[PDB]
Symmetry: C4
Subunit: 191 residues, 4 copies
C-alpha cells in the first residue's frame, strides 16, 4: 500500500536517473559517478554533443516512453526543449607564461536553445557548461501496488564543472522530479 | 564422503550457472550481476538474440557437454527446447505528452518456440521478456570423491525485467537443478 | 641487511610472478586472479597458444632477461623447454542425452614438448591442461642492499583446470623459486 | 576564508595532478595508481613516447592553460622544457644462461633534452627512466573565496622504475607545487 508506494516512487526516480546517465553521458559505466570527468577538449566536445544528440534521438533508442517538454522561464525560451548553457568570466586575460592575469569575474551566461524534433568554448575563462531539459513519463509500475499510474516530469541537469580550472572537468547528471495526477487516467478493472 | 559430496554438488551448480552467464548474457563480466542491464532497444534486441543464438551454437562452443531437453507443459510446446516469451498489457495506450493513459492491465503472454538443431517488442506496454530452456549434463567431478557421476537437468531462466518501466531493464539468469541417478552409469573399477 | 634481504627476495619472486601472468595469460588484468577463466573452446585454445607463443617470443618482448632451461625428468624430455600436457580419462563415453556414461577413470597424460628457439582436446573427458617451463634470471636488486646478485630459477606452471566439468575452466599461473649463488658473480667495488 | 583557502589549494594541486595522470600516462584509469605498470618493451616505449608527445601537444588538447618553463640546473639544459633521462649500470654483463654476471654498479645517467614548441634502452642494465618537466598555471578558483588568483609552478616527475629488475616496471607520476603571488594580478571589483 503506502509504505510500498513511497519506496516504489523513490526507486522509480532512481532507476530513470540511472537510465539517463547511461543514455546521455558518453562512456558512462556504473560506479564511476564521482570520478567521471573529461580531460581533453575533444572528450569534452564529444561528451557535450553526445548528450544533445541522444536527447534528439531519444524516441528512437530509449526503452522508456518520454515526452518532451517545452517552455519555462529558465533557461528555455519558448519552443525550447534543451538549453545548452555556457558560463565564463566577462573578462579573462590569463597569461601564466608571464605570471599575469587580468580579470573581470562577472559571469556571463550564453545559452543555445535546442527544440526537440556548433559551440565555441572559452576554456581559459570557462566556469562551466550545463545542459538543461525536461522529460515527462507515466509511472506504470503503480499498477502492481494496485494504484493509478502517476505523471512524472523529470528535470534533467548535466553539469561539466570547470570551476576549479584544474585541467579536470567532472561531469554529473542530476534530476528533480515533479509528481502529479495524470489528466486522464483509465485503468479498466473488472475482468 | 558426504559432507564433501554436498559441497561439490552445490559448487557444481554454481560453476555451471556462472558458465551460463558468460555464454548467454551479451557483454557479461563477473561482479556485474545486480547492475547488468539494457538501456537502449538495440542493446536489448542484441542481448535477446545473442542468448538464443548461443543456445543454438552451444554444442560447438561450450567447454561442457550439454544435452538439449524437449517438451514440458510451460512453456515448451512439444518439440520445443527454448521458449522466448513476451508479457505485455492487453491494452496499453500510454501518452505522457498529454498526461494520459488508458490501460487494461491484464497481462498477455506471447511465446515463440525454438527447437534445438524476428520479434516485435511492445516497449510502452512491456512487462518483461523471458527465455526458458533446459540443459542436461553428467556430474563427472563425483569420481574424485569416489562416487558415481550424477545426472543433472538445469532449468535456465533469463529475465529482461521491465516491470518498473524506468528506461532501465535489468537482465538476470537463474537456474534450478534437478538431480537424479543416471539410467546407466558404468565406471570401470579394478585396475 | 638481512631482514631486508628476505623481503626483497620475496618481493622479487612476487613481481616476476605478476609479470609472468601479464605475459603468458591472454586477457589477464590485476585483481582477476580467482575469477580468471575460459568459457568457450576458442577462448581456451587462444589462451593455450598465446602462452606458448609468448614463451617463444620472450627474449624479444620481456622487460626482464630470462634464460631458458632444458631437461629434467618431468615432464621435459631432453632438449625440452616447455611441456604442454593433457590429462583425460582413458575411457570417457559421456552421453547426457540418454542419461548414460561409461567411464574408465584412469587418467592418461599426453604431453607435447616444445624446445625454445596443433593440439586436439578431449573436452568431454578432459581433466586438465598444464603448461610447464623453467626460466632463470639474476636477482640484480641485491646491489641496493649491498649484496651479490642471486641466481634464480623460476618453475612456471599454468593450469587450465577442468576437474569440475562445469563449463567453466579457471586458469592460473604459479611459480616455485629455486635460489642459489651464481657460478661467477663479479661486482667491481672500489670506485 | 583561510581554512577554505588551504583546502582549495590542496584540492587544486590534487586535481591538476590527476589531470596530469590522464594526459601523460598511456592507458591510465582512476584507481589503478599502484598497479599501473609496463610488462613488454613495446608498452614501455609506447608509454614513454606518449608522455613526451602529450607534453608537446598540451596547448592543443588540455582543458587547462599551462605555460612551459625553461631552464634550471637539473636536468634541464637551457632552452629545455622536458628531460627524458636514462639510468643504467656503467657495466652490466648479465648472463643467466651461464649463471654469471659482471657488474660495475656505478649508475650512469643519460638525459635527452626536449624543448617545448629516438631512444635506446638498456633493459638488462636499466635502473630506471624518468621524465621531468615544469608547467605553470594560475589558480583561478581563488576568486570564489574572494581571493586574488595564485601563481603555481608544477614540477612533474614520471618514473618508469626498473630497480627490481623483475620484468615488471611500475609507472608513476608525482608533482611538487611551488606557490607564489603573480607578477601582475588584476581583478576588476566594483560592479
Amino acid at each position: 500500500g503506502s509504505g510500498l508506494s513511497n519506496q516504489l516512487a523513490v526507486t522509480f526516480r532512481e532507476e530513470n536517473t540511472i537510465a539517463f546517465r547511461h543514455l546521455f553521458l558518453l562512456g558512462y559505466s556504473d560506479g564511476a559517478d564521482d570520478t567521471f570527468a573529461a580531460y581533453t577538449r575533444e572528450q569534452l566536445y564529444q561528451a557535450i554533443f553526445h548528450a544533445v544528440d541522444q536527447y534528439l534521438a531519444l524516441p528512437d533508442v530509449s526503452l522508456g516512453r518520454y515526452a518532451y517538454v517545452r517552455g519555462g522561464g529558465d533557461p528555455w525560451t519558448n519552443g525550447s526543449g534543451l538549453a545548452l548553457c555556457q558560463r565564463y568570466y566577462h573578462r579573462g586575460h590569463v597569461d601564466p607564461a608571464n605570471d599575469t592575469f587580468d580579470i573581470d569575474p562577472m559571469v556571463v551566461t550564453d545559452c543555445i536553445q535546442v527544440d526537440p524534433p556548433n559551440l565555441t568554448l572559452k576554456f581559459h575563462k570557462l566556469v562551466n557548461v550545463t545542459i538543461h531539459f525536461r522529460l515527462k513519463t507515466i509511472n506504470l509500475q503503480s499498477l502492481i501496488n494496485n494504484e493509478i499510474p502517476d505523471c512524472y516530469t523529470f528535470s534533467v541537469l548535466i553539469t561539466f564543472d570547470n570551476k576549479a580550472h584544474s585541467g579536470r572537468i567532472p561531469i554529473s547528471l542530476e534530476t528533480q522530479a515533479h509528481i502529479q495526477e495524470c489528466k486522464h487516467p483509465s485503468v479498466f478493472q473488472h475482468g
